[PDB]
């Protein structure tokens, strides 16, 4: 946990003052006044949303969601009423793929990419057995929500330096695109249906389109092929005063 | 497409369920009422060109400013644009009064109608006076039957509280 | 991202080399026209909704093929999308101006533009057609030459901010190409 | 409030930071600049009864129809009402050039300006009007220094802008 | 949150009153000692860590009962919290400090903290030793007087920002009090 | 994930074959050297955090372009990270000697590490000398060959386990390749 | 890059606003005061391998342990290391003078510095000697002007800080 590309090569992440004021005995904040909320505001929708190009016809639907945020600064709460709105369904579920949901999810409210095969079947058991609300119920009260983000800030793509997995790095740099990328260029067809399932990695180019400024992105690329080969059983020797031995 | 039978499959489709008969009767209702709001199919499509006719010229008349330089309708194609600016809101009330709910209007015709008629400098006073002429320019008997009369006066004053 | 000041910083540092006084004359020189800049960009981001309004319209005046049924700015939501992005287009060169650099437009808006217009089917030449109007008419605000919106400023050549803003309108036209 | 020191102390909040002097560089643009801006701000405070007398007249002359019955206009005190809602706007631009940001302008006149326009039927061509009166009716020299002319417009096409 | 500029903007607002000549001599003598708040505020931030380090070395100094077992500043974690603390409180008091208005303080870092603290544990009267300490260590640098750390300045009276600083100390020892 | 004990049983599951007598020498012996094993991952994870500044250390001795500017590991940063990465290989290789199986490695670890490091533009050759250092100090610390630290074992022969770990280093070396 | 360009145009972008005039001032202020903190420019390049010099060898005079066997500065080429790591640094501060905020250094030299330091058992008491000597090396009169003095010194008192 170092994060050599967090805060230097990328900006801090945005939300709330603090949680102290939470303690509520004459308010529940400091009043960010109305001048640093609609900015907070601005920056929510470009993560939940993922830059969806939201008309103000179609922002006339959250004002309520909007006007219990400014009044009780709970983000988590926030991000709650707009997932299971019109809208957020509307773009994500209605002309999708399953697992393309399921994946959208992870890149909006959580920050990362799914880790396994098995994380996805259990999304999918909990959406069958009664609804989609139970997915983003699950997500958003998860312990991971809690001890990534919490009621402060703004849900980020975090480098976290230590990831868990590392198909969990490639696969949160392939959801998360570059600026002026937005979530509807493919007509469903999830980017990682295929690799989830399989257990192979993802397009080295598309995963450097998607890194920060200054991180010699795409570089060291050897002209064959980039996937490895699981079959193979290479020889590679040590060097000793009598000879080389093949320790393997 | 907001549609009776868009609503059920939809609400269905969140709970995870198979369409139930509270689902079926919804479109029960439409089997009854289609009739009567399909009987003015014939009468928007088949007068339509007399109806945008009588409509853009009690606009113009009632906001008689317009005509002067510098606002919309300055020359001639612009007014030529604003006859079928509102062509294409009677052929909006048409698709909405086939499909059974207001999908077509609000998202072909309301769904960011208020970026491009402020940039341009629209005014949509000018929009709603053409409308509610052609609101209040139905009497039902002769035009209708009794109930083809209130269902697509129930969709033209839906675009009227939309712009307004 | 990086401006003026930080591009000569990470040239210099490919070389490990010092910032000395041979370098600082282009910098020094960059702080001369510095309220020349600000004139500028006020100027520019004081037209900022009617160069758009006016981008749009003239896109739609020679190709009325956008306007009718299957095209691509056809109804009232394609318009407002296609609105949007004349605008967010011009800010992002009104930051790369201010900056000094376009460190910032071929990393935060250009980056995967081609390919989301591609995915999206939307014509690209069409779109560099609204580019050069909104270049032309950039040009037009920093020379003072535009027809009407007469702009009180201070006497002088503001010819190389125009050419650098060009250039910068230019990548933008060139990304997406 | 959108004023320099706002923007660099929040940032250094947001990042958990002491203020550097990147941030103290920002207070100093300040200090320069006040004087130019001040200016204004006086020029503005005494003379504001006589630039509300001729804005709300410039607007009423230039669309002589709102005073139609129906309209905004339709009796007196509603005109008095106009004068007084352009007398806020001015009031704000002083505030705005006090604070050195449009803290006050783009949360007390222009945040929610949109739905008590467009429901209250007030067409905004002629709050932009009356407010592009004021931006030429000023000469730079006479009325003013220089620069105190630049940031004044400055000011006032941001509203301009917003509204449009 | 609110500034000095801000203050008298509000004050006026509740009164529909323009601001006029007669209320700028305030501000524009804000204005006057501009550069010797610039000139105070990186004096204080130039030893912030030093300060808090002395801080809550000299709370422990004369209650040696925090360190015992049972202490609240007892373990490694607790020693780490609790410097932490000294960098917000004296980061909150050079924020209000550069703004001329306490209004950031109250809101954002003072709002709630007493009973955070009574639902935590954290004895009072030590935290408000602690504060104290580098209170007396803000005038310190801010006049100049400290026995070392001889920082060059301009030659004149800073003696009201030091009162200023103390007012704003003064207000996060009575607000957890 | 798997182990010694739930590699065999997947296997026979593959057959719908009991698991008998004959498929349990493997896993009795198994159960035999255990302790050998238990005072193996102790002295090898005894000697974590030096192992891991060795070779990293090592890694630069015969390739010092690594340092130079425009070097994969120049700044603070990447060395930071850079050690972070030897960890987290040995970490999962300790695992992996632990379970008696490799099971843990290449999906938790080698499972999309090459295309991470293409993107990132880590070089591979340096990164493989810097796993073949880690791997020859392992076996030097399960033999107790060691030319200092001098641990205390029982008597025997733990050639095995030190061929075993041997191959586990391998996949990973073989794995970002 | 911590810059105050980059510290307004974030906070526009952040906002989803055009540049405003609270902006342009902090521009201003860097157009003040740029001449002061580059005048210390030519004195970190041209005077630098003498700086360096002072200061490696004052590091090593407060802390003749390190020399010792099993310490950092067992051999000779690790001394050499260590002068090249506080050449570095010298580097980083002309960087920061140039940029007008304290984007390269923290993100070049102090950003995981930690680990790095540690693991490789560096004392960074060792490093901040070596600093704050050249922080009282330095004489207003004769070395620069008067603010060129303050703002080096408030640069290299920074990651005085940070290193702590
Ligand atoms: C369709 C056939 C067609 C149009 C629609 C219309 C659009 C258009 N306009 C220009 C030229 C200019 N646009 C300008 C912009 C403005 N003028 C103003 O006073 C405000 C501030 C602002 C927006 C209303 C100006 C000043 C010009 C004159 C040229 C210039 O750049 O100054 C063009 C030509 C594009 C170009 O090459 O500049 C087009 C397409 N004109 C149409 O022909
Ligand atoms: C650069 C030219 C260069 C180095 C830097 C340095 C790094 C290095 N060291 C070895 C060999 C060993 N490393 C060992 C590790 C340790 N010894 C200890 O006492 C503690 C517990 C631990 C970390 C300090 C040991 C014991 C050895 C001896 C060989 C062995 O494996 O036991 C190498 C060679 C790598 C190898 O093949 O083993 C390198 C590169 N040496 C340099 O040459
Ligand atoms: C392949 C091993 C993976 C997989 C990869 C994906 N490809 C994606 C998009 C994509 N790929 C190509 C190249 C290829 N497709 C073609 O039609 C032709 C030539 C006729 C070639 C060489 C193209 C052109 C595209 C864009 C159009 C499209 O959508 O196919 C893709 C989507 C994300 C992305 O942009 O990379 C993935 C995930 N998909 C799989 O299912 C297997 C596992
Ligand atoms: C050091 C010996 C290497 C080297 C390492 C670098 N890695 C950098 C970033 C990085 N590394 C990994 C892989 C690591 N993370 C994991 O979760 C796991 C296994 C579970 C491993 C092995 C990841 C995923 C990342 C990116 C994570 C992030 O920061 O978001 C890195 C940063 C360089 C920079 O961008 O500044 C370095 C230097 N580099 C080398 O040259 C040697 C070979
Ligand atoms: C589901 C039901 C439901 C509601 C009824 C409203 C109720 C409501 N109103 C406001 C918020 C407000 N409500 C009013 C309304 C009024 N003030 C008056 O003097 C009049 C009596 C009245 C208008 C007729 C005003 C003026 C504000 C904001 C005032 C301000 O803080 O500036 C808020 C705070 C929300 C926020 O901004 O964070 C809420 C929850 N919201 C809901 O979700
Ligand atoms: C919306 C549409 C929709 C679907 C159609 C299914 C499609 C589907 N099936 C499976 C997953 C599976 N699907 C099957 C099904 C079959 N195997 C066979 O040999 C038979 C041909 C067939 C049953 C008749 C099996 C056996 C598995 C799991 C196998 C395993 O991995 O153990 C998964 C993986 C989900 C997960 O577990 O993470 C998905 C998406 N899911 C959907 O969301
Ligand atoms: C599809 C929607 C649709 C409508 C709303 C009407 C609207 C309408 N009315 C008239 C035309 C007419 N409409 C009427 C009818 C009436 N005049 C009155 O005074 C009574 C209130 C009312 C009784 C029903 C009369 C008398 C004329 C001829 C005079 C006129 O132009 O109004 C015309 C010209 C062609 C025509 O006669 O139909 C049209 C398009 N017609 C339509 O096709
Ligand atoms: C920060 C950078 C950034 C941008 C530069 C834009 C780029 C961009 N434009 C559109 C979206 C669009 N872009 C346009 C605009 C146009 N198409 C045309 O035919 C014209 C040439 C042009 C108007 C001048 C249109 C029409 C759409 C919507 C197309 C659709 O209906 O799918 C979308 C996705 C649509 C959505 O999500 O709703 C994106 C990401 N947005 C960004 O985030
Ligand atoms: C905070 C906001 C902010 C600004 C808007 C600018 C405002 C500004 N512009 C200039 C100053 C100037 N502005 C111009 C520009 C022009 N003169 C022309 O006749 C051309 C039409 C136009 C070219 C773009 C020129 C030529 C000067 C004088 C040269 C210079 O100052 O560098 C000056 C210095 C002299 C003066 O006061 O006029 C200032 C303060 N600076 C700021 O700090
Ligand atoms: C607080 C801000 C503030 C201002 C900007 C001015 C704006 C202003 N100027 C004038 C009045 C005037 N304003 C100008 C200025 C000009 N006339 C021109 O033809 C040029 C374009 C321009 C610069 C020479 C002149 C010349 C008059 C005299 C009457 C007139 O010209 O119509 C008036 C009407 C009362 C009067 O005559 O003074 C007002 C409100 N007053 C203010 O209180
Ligand atoms: C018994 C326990 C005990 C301690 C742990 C120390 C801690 C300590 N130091 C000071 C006192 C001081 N602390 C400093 C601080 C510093 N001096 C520097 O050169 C650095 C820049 C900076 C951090 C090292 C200074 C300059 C003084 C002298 C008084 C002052 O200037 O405020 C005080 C008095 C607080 C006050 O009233 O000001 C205390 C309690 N002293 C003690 O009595
Ligand atoms: C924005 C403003 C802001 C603050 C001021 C702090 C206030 C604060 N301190 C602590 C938490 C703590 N705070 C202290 C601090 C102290 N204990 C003492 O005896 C001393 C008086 C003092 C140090 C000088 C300690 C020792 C703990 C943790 C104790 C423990 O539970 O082990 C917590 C709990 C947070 C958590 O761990 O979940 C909070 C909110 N945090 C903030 O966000
Ligand atoms: C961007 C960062 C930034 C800064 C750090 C300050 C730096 C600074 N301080 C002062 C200027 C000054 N600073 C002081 C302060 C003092 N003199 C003393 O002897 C006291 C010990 C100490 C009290 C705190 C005084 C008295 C002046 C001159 C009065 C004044 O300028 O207002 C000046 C103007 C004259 C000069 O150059 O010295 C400047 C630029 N301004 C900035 O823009
Ligand atoms: C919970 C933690 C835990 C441990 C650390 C081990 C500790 C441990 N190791 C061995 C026992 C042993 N350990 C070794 C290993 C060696 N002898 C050598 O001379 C070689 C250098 C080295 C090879 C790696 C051998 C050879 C035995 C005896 C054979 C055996 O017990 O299987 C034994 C049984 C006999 C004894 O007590 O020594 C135990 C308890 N077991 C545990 O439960």
């Given at each position: 946990?170092?994060?050599?590309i967090?805060?230097?090569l ?159 790095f490639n696969?949160m740099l392939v959801?998360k695109g570059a600026?002026?990328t ?19 990695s993802q397009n080295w180019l598309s995963m450097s389109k998607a890194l920060p400024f200054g991180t010699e992105k795409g570089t060291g690329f050897n002209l064959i092929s980039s996937s ?21 | ?164 | ?105 071929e990393d935060?808006?250009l980056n995967g533009?081609?390919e ?62």
């Open positions: 946990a170092f994060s050599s967090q805060n230097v990328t900006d801090a992440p945005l939300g709330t003052p603090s949680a102290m004021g939470f303690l509520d005995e004459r308010t529940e904040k400091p009043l960010m006044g109305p001048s640093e909320m609609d900015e907070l505001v601005y920056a929510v929708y470009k993560q939940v949303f993922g830059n969806a190009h939201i008309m103000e016809s179609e922002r006339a639907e959250l004002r309520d969601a909007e006007s219990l945020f400014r009044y009780l600064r709970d983000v988590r709460e926030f991000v709650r009423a707009l997932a299971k709105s019109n809208a957020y369904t509307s773009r994500f579920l209605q002309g999708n793929q399953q697992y393309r949901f399921f994946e959208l999810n992870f890149k909006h409210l959580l920050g990362r990419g799914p880790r396994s095969l098995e994380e996805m079947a259990s999304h999918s058991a909990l959406y069958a057995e009664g609804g989609f609300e139970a997915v983003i119920d699950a997500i958003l009260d998860s312990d991971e929500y809690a001890q990534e983000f919490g009621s402060t800030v703004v849900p980020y793509c975090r480098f976290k330096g230590e990831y868990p997995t590392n198909e969990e696969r959801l600026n002026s937005s979530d509807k260029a493919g007509k469903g067809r999830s980017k990682l249906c295929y690799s989830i399932a399989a257990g192979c490895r080969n699981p079959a193979a059983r290479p020889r590679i020797g040590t060097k000793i005063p009598g000879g080389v031995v093949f320790s393997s | 497409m907001k549609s009776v039978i868009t609503t059920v499959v939809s609400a269905a489709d969140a709970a995870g369920r198979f369409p139930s008969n509270s689902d079926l009767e919804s479109i029960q209702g439409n089997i009854q009422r289609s009739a009567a709001r399909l009987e003015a199919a014939e009468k928007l499509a088949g007068n339509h060109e007399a109806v945008v006719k009588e409509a853009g010229d009690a606009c113009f008349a009632k906001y008689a400013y317009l005509k002067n330089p510098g606002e919309a309708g300055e020359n001639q194609e612009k007014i030529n644009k604003c006859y079928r600016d509102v062509d294409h809101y009677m052929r909006l009330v048409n698709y909405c009064l086939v499909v059974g709910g207001t999908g077509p209007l609000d998202e072909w015709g309301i769904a960011g109608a208020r970026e491009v008629y402020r940039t341009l400098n629209l005014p949509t006073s000018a929009y709603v006076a053409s409308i509610a002429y052609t609101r209040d320019r139905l009497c039902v008997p002769r035009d209708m039957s009794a109930q083809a009369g209130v269902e697509f006066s129930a969709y033209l004053d839906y675009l009227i509280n939309a712009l307004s | 991202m990086l401006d003026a000041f930080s591009r000569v910083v990470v040239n210099s540092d490919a070389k490990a080399a010092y910032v000395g006084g041979s370098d600082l004359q282009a910098l020094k020189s960059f702080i001369a026209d510095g309220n020349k800049r600000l004139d500028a960009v006020n100027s520019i981001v004081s037209n900022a909704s009617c160069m758009v309004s006016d981008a749009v319209s003239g896109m739609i005046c020679e190709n009325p093929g956008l306007i009718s049924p299957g095209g691509n700015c056809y109804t009232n939501r394609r318009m407002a999308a296609c609105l949007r992005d004349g605008e967010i287009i011009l800010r992002y060169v009104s930051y790369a101006l201010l900056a000094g650099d376009a460190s910032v437009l935060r808006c533009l081609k989301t217009y591609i995915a999206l089917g939307v014509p690209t030449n069409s779109s560099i057609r609204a580019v050069s109007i909104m270049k032309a008419q950039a040009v037009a605000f920093i020379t003072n030459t535009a027809t009407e919106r007469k702009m009180s400023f201070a006497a002088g050549d503001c010819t190389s901010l125009a050419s650098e803003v060009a250039s910068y309108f230019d990548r933008v036209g060139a990304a997406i190409s």
